[model samples]
Target: MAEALFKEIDVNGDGAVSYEEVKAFVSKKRAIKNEQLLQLIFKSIDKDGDGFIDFEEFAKFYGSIA
Candidate 1:
């Protein structure tokens, strides 16, 4: 479940998910309009304070996403 979802989020097939990828993937499920909402979630999940959410980071968020 986590692996497939991560690939979907990694839109560029770069092996790492960028903020833009998250915005695109999440906004659809979330149907979000607020940029702040997007910021808050990404900032929280990208635990290294990096622009990309690598597999480890993605896995962490994936487990708790429900």
Candidate 2:
């Protein structure tokens, strides 16, 4: 399920998700109006700090929340 969700948000069909993609994806799901908080959450999910969220990182974050 998370994989499908990730694919949906990775708009360009890239292997990873960027901040803009995540912001647009998440905004549709819930009220994440705070930019700083969103960045923090994205950073947490992007464990390697490569400025993008890969499948493994997204899976861990999604699993924890789901």
Candidate 3:
């Protein structure tokens, strides 16, 4: 699920990813009923809420080996 999530986040078809890419992907995927939820999730992942998810945020969410 995490791997799939990561792939979806790389929206530009680029091997690398960005905060906007991940946020956009998640927002679009669940915008039907839980727009707020999506926002909250983005916020949580964004940590400091700097309006962007850098390597720290990405690593925090995507690097965990569960």
User: Which candidate leads in lDDT?
Assistant: 2
- Candidate 2 backbone collisions, by pair: none
TM-score of 1: 0.46
Task: Give the alpha carbon lDDT tens digit for every residue of 1-66 in model 2.
Answer: 989888999989988999999888888666655866899889999999999999999999999999
lDDT of 3 by residue, 1-66 (tens): 987877878888787888888778767877744878777778888988788888988788887643
Model 1 stretches astray by more than 4 angstroms: 1-33
Stretches of candidate 3 off by over 4 Å are: 1-32
TM, every model: 0.46, 0.48, 0.42
| Per-model CA lDDT versus the true structure | 0.85, 0.88, 0.79
For model 2, state the Cα shift of residue 34 in Å.
1.4
Worst 10 residues of 1 by lDDT: 27-36
Error of 2 at 24 (Å): 25
Model 3 residue 42 distance off true place after TM-score fit, in angstroms = 0.4
Point out the higher-scoring one by TM-score: 2 or 3: 2
Q: Model 3 Cα displacement at 7 (Å)? A: 42
